[PDB]
């Protein structure tokens, strides 16, 4: 049921950063072995990313520091 990024922008009041972070997350999960953090019901990878965004737990800060603890 992902049609509007309304609250996706309520977190990131940018409506642009959205594309960036969602793209990083999608590139992660589609080809890279990054598993959804959110229960998936046959929704495409980018829809998964937007889900993970719209729940206040994935952003620049959190995903970047995940990549940092990764390094």
């Amino acid at each position: 049921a992902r049609v509007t990024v309304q609250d996706a922008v309520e977190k990131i009041g940018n409506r642009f950063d959205l594309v960036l972070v969602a793209a990083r997350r999608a590139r992660q999960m589609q080809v890279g072995g990054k598993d959804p953090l959110v229960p998936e019901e046959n929704d495409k990878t980018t829809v998964i990313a937007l889900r993970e965004i719209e729940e206040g737990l994935i952003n620049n800060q959190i995903l970047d520091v995940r990549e940092r603890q990764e390094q």
């Binding site: 309304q6 009041g13 409506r15 495409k44």
Partner: protein, 1335 residues
């Protein structure tokens, strides 16, 4: 990858440095082997391998033998890809003068030698000679000779004196010309001259010389001696790319060109008679000419079939050169096109899509999925499987679509919504359904339109589309915060037919307790729909802290009102619905819903609305037939009486009792009368014929004619449409624009007779042709518009300033047009606002102004508000957010980085598709006031003002101006200033039928120097009798005394010139041609009659010329500086005058076409910018004499009013930003502590930051003045030439940048497209931030 692009010239050295060889043989192909020739225009020997990795040696097969050249072939061994791009060159036999640098208009070479063009010309084609260092004779380095002159002189001067003809001498001169000494010479001469024309020519020349001698450019290079030749694979022998075949005619020129070259040598090789060697030189020059840019000579070399062929320049320009053909517009893969249909079952966020196109558009995806699934094994297997639709495929495709977006567009892309995103549903059909709302944005009928569709590939792309171009994201027209999802026409008819009331229907007026019951009693057929009824309901509101508290009540309404009401979402009060609900009602309902609720409620709402409307319209049975057209019974009455009268007035004229023009006018007016009367007759008769008992007699409410039902619905059709249907459709135009005497007496119910129909025919053809031309011109208009901004991007937030402009409602003098509520709504204010009561600040300092704030204001008779504006921003490269405000489509402060220019331009350019081509009787009640006042009392003891600047203003009882009016010199006021006023009266009035030339004290007048014959005349007044010694025009009076013109010394009984009250100088003015004081000599007049008496487009092209900074025709001269007025030298061709300040030197001494009518007499001291004459406003002068906000507000008001005349709506910020661009270069006026010159110009913001650096030091930088350039001007003078080259006129700008030797830092959009990188527009803005941050 790589940074800025640079342009420069090329010494023939560098040409050699390029080419991989040199071509001499004029032919190409063996016609048996079809292979290239040995040393020809296609030969491998330079260009390279026709296959890859092997040539006619057959010697080198694998990577072991690649690379190393052959000896049999001689050619290197490699792939044929490099053949596409390797360049060649010819060695010239005789030098050649380049054409571009010759016909720059003006020639950047003739001026380089200061030469008249035609002389260098005749030098070229050798029609004359030219003197190079004439030496010990009277002949000069720039002198030329008629041939015979050369012959004769050369006889007596067959010495070291030198005279030749041709590019020979030109390469000589250029090579033999140093610059620095020349530069200094120009410095001196310039500094010395008092003639301005010389000054301008000299400053241009010294500029170009500093240009050359600035960088490493050498002028002679404009003479060609080494011709670079194009890589072979770009001008192929035949394209053969399907279809008809082209000829790639370049080679031909090349061929013939090369031909002549060898001939030249060959004939030189024979020691030919030099006359004919001259001829062959000429042939060569014309040849290279025609190669570079055909047509610039006399006879453009037609190709064949009577067609001109194509040079290297034709590939470049027009709507077919690389730029406008393939660099910008480009056909793209993964796309499709088809016809369209509706499919109303769809919800908002989705589009129908046929199976087939769906299948092709995703072939790669399907392959990938199959081979991931193992159902196929190789790509060929997959191809075969997809071929014959192995029935698995579909579900595969199903998975692929699951949320994969698609992008739809129409052909003529007007604005930001002409292209959107969707998520398709698959159809076993061939056409495209469509959510029937969006069809408005697409301006699309369903009569055979053809839509196009493309597909994003990268996940990033799907995301872009998803968040930013989905129908669920585009609901507020970017032109104006209007919801752009207007339920268009048939949903409208439905709803209207639903919310309504019949006088007495089934079970009307009973009582109910729930709209559920309403539905039931409707469907059960136990209750009618449009019937009054008492019903219990409830409703909600989150008026409290987010909590939508609900609460009940009982209303009396109609059923369908409730039926609908079950749908209206939560936070709405009922009274929004109790009305009868035409169209704009549902519009504003949508808007407030969006404003209070958010987004998802709104979309769900709109969808449900469409559903319900379609359904109930369906149930309605809203047909139409021969009985829907009522008829005025009294039509024949009005018509018969009208014609009876007109017969009378015509036989009256034909008897010779009136004039034909006014008789025609009377006929016009009487037909207009009968027209409007029959209009009233019909429209009224129709609109009310409800006569039905109510258990009593009857009542009469809004009737139910399907026609009338539409009209009152406003769903479709104009009231005038009806007018034509029933009433006679009056009179039509004329090919001129005149009107036929007799009107169209008939309706459409009855049939037209031949002639009326014929006339209508003509008018319709007119309108259609105008439709064609209008679309045409709107095209080029929006082109220029989009092109002029093309780069303005929100770069920051808050430029750190508290200025702007004080906006106010507009008053056309009478009624006001925009309530102050609008200009403010969503435009961040710099200063706060006060109440009319002093010290009563209302809004905070620099806050963003949304709607509740508009309320808080509006209730308090708010007057006028200063606010941030783009013209005033304090930032380079863009504009701070608060200077812009709200996104006009997203009800919040606009985010950081949008391209505001392009949205503005589209908005503005769109509506052109449809656009066209005394007394003061106040009506209101309040207080009168005035401004720019200087009045007079009469023996009447009333106010009569004495200026052409006086400003009546009617203030209401609230505190907000309702009226104001400019009222001319000499207008008697019945009241004063500070009284009451009512409606139906005039407070003041004057006589525009004369020229008030009054003086304002009682005394004595004279015929001073008013001696008949020389400057005045005697008038034995044939109308009254008074011997008014009347003044004629002195310049048409005698030729000696036309200087000693009639002064009117205002004197008293003492005869002394009465020094003007308070002043020490009396009114000694003039009575010019036909300025008459009928009052005789020595008369003691009292104030109340003028001394001297003198009885006295707008369509789209208006906007067009406006933005082009076009010419006012007869501009009105303003005041450069204050002071008084004097008259000196006269008819040096024209009138003259001088003006003097109160403290400074009289700087203004200007002549005037004597026709002009002055505005202020001599003695008066006026203020700068007072309109000293009559006429329009000279925009450049408006700027430099009025500052900025003046001309801005001006332009804003003009365009807004031309639009207002057509109901369309555009927020002003667009016009703001357009102007904001319009001025970008300022002319320095004092070099100051900076470096640049004085009489030149520089980018405003650049020199501004220059000061910001300078003025950080006490050394004060350059003073300046901002300038005004029309869009077509500023389109060229940009930091970029590539974007310029994208615009019109490639040639001059291109050769210009080349001569200059510029370098483009790629700061902009129309250039970041060409290189193809992420334009700093959206995401790309972020990445560009980043990429700059790196280095």
């Amino acid at each position: 990858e790589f940074d800025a692009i640079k342009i420069a010239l090329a010494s023939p050295d560098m040409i050699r440095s390029w080419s991989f060889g040199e071509v001499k043989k004029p032919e190409t192909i063996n016609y048996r082997t079809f292979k290239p020739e040995r040393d020809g225009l296609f030969c491998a020997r330079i260009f390279g391998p026709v296959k890859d990795y092997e040539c006619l040696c057959g010697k080198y097969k694998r990577l072991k033998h690649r690379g190393v050249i052959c000896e049999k072939c001689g050619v290197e061994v490699t792939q044929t890809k490099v053949r596409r791009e390797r360049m060649g060159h010819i060695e010239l036999a005789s030098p050649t003068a380049h054409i571009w640098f010759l016909k720059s208009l003006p020639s950047r070479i003739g001026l380089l030698l200061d030469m008249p063009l035609r002389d260098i010309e005749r030098v070229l084609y050798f029609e004359s000679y030219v003197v190079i260092e004439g030496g010990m004779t009277n002949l000069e380095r720039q002198q030329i000779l008629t041939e015979e002159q050369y012959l004769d002189a050369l006889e007596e001067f067959g010495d070291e004196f030198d005279a030749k003809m041709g590019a020979e001498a030109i390469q000589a001169l250029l090579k033999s010309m140093d610059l620095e000494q020349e530069c200094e010479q120009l410095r001196e001469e310039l500094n010395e001259t008092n003639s301005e024309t010389k000054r301008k020519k000299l400053t241009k020349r010294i500029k170009l010389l500093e240009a050359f001698v600035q960088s490493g450019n050498k002028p002679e290079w404009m003479i060609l001696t080494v011709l670079p030749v194009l890589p072979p694979d770009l001008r192929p022998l035949v394209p053969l790319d399907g279809g008809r075949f082209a000829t790639s005619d370049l080679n031909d020129l090349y061929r013939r060109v090369i031909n002549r070259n060898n001939r030249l040598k060959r004939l030189l090789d024979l020691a030919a008679p030099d006359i004919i060697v001259r001829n062959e030189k000429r042939m060569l020059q014309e040849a290279v000419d025609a190669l570079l840019d055909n047509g610039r000579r006399g006879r453009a070399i037609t190709g064949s079939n009577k067609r001109p062929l194509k040079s290297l320049a034709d590939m470049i320009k027009g709507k077919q050169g690389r730029f406008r053909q393939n660099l910008l517009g480009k056909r793209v893969d993964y796309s499709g096109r088809s016809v369209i249909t509706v499919g109303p079952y769809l919800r908002l966020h989705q589009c129908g899509l046929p199976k087939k196109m769906a299948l092709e558009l995703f072939k790669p995806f399907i392959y990938g999925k199959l081979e991931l699934r193992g159902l196929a094994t190789t790509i060929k297997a997959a191809k075969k499987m997809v071929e014959r639709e192995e029935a698995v495929v579909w579900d595969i495709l199903d998975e692929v679509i699951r949320e994969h977006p698609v992008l739809l567009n129409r052909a003529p892309t007007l604005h930001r919504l002409g292209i959107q995103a969707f998520e398709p549903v698959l159809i076993e059909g061939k056409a495209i359904q469509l959510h029937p709302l969006v069809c408005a944005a697409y301006n699309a009928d369903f009569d055979g339109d053809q839509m196009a569709v493309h597909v994003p590939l990268t996940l990033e792309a799907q995301l872009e589309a998803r968040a930013l171009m989905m129908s669920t994201n585009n609901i507020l027209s970017p032109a104006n915060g209007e919801p752009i999802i207007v339920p268009s026409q048939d949903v409208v008819l439905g709803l209207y037919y639903m919310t309504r009331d019949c006088v007495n229907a089934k079970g009307e007026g009973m009582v109910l307790t729930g709209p559920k019951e309403a539905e039931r009693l409707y469907r059960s057929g136990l209750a009618s729909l449009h019937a009054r009824v008492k019903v219990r309901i409830t409703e909600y509101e989150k008026d409290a802290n987010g909590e939508l508290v609900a609460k009940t009540s009982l209303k009396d309404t109609t059923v369908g009102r409730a039926i609908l009401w079950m749908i209206v979402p939560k936070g709405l009060p009922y009274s929004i619905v109790n009305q009868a609900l035409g169209k704009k009602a549902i519009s504003k309902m949508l808007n407030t819903c969006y404003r209070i609720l958010g987004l998802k409620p709104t979309v769900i709402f709109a969808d449900q609305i469409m559903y319900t409307g379609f359904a109930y319209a369906a149930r309605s049975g809203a047909s139409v037939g021969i009985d829907d057209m009522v008829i005025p019974e009294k039509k024949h009455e009005i018509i018969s009486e009208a014609e009876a009268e007109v017969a009378e007035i015509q036989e009256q004229f034909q008897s010779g009792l009136v004039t034909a023009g006014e008789r025609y006018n009377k006929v016009i007016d009487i037909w207009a009368a009968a027209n409007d009367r029959v209009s009233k007759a019909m429209m009224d008769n129709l609109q009310t014929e409800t006569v039905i008992n109510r258990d009593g007699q009857e009542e009469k409410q809004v009737s139910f004619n399907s026609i009338y039902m539409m009209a009152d619905s406003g769903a479709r059709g104009s009231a005038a449409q009806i007018r034509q249907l029933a009433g006679m459709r009056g009179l039509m135009a004329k090919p001129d624009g005149s009107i036929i005497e007799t009107p169209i007496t008939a309706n459409f119910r009855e049939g037209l007779n031949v002639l009326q129909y014929f006339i209508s025919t003509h008018g319709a053809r007119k309108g259609l042709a105008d439709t064609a031309l209008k679309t045409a011109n709107s095209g080029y208009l929006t082109r220029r518009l989009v092109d002029v901004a093309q780069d303005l991007v929100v770069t920051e937030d808050d430029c750190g300033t508290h200025e702007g402009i004080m906006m106010t409602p507009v008053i056309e003098g009478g009624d006001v047009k925009e309530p102050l509520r609008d200009r403010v709504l969503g435009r961040v204010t710099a200063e706060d606002v006060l109440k009319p009561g002093t010290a009563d600040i209302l809004v905070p300092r620099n806050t963003l102004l949304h709607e509740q704030w508009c309320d808080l204001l509006e209730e308090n008779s708010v007057d006028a508000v200063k606010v941030r504006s783009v013209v005033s921003c304090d930032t380079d490269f863009g504009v701070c957010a608060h200077c812009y405000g709200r996104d006009l489509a997203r009800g919040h402060i606009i985010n950081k980085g949008e391209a505001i220019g392009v949205i503005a331009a589209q908005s503005i350019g769109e509506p052109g598709t449809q656009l066209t081509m005394s007394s003061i009787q106040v009506k209101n009640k309040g207080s009168i006031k005035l401004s720019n006042v200087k009045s007079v009392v009469n023996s009447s003891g009333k106010l009569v003002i004495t200026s052409r600047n006086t400003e009546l203003k009617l203030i209401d009882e609230f505190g907000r101006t309702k009226e104001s009016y400019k009222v001319p010199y000499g207008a008697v006021l019945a009241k004063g200033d500070g009284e009451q006023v009512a409606g139906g009266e005039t407070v003041a009035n004057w006589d525009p039928h004369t020229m008030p030339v009054i003086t304002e004290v009682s005394g004595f007048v004279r015929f001073t120097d008013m001696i008949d014959g020389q400057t005045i005349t005697r008038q034995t007044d044939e109308l009254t009798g008074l011997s008014s010694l009347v003044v004629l025009d002195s310049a048409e009076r005698t030729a000696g005394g036309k200087d000693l013109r009639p002064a009117l010394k205002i004197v008293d009984a003492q005869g002394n010139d009465v020094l003007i009250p308070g002043t020490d100088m009396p009114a000694q003015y003039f009575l010019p041609g036909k300025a008459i004081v009928q009052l005789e000599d020595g008369v003691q007049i009292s104030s109340g009659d003028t001394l001297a008496r003198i009885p006295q487009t707008g369509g789209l092209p208006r906007v067009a010329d406006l933005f082009e900074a076009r010419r006012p025709k007869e501009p009105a001269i303003l005041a450069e500086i204050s002071g008084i007025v004097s008259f000196g030298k006269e008819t040096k061709g024209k009138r003259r005058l001088v003006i003097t300040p109160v403290d400074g030197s009289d700087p203004y001494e200007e002549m005037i076409p004597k026709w002009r009518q002055l505005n202020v007499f001599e003695g008066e001291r006026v203020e700068r910018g007072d309109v000293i004459s009559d006429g329009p406003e000279a925009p450049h002068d408006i700027l430099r004499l009025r500052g900025v906000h003046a001309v801005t507000r001006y332009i804003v008001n003009e365009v807004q009013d031309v639009y207002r005349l057509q109901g369309v709506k555009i927020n002003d910020k667009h016009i703001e930003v357009i102007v904001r661009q319009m001025l970008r270069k300022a002319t320095i006026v004092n070099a100051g502590s900076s470096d640049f010159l004085e009489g030149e110009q520089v980018e405003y913001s650049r020199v501004k930051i220059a000061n910001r650096e300078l003025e950080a030091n006490g050394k004060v930088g350059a003073t300046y003045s901002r300038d005004l350039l029309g869009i077509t001007k500023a389109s060229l003078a940009t930091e970029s030439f590539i974007s310029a080259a994208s615009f019109q006129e490639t040639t001059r700008v291109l050769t210009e940048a080349a001569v200059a030797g510029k370098r483009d830092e790629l700061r902009g959009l129309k250039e970041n497209v060409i290189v193809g990188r992420l334009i700093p527009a959206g995401t790309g803005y972020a990445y560009h931030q980043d990429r700059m941050r790196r280095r």
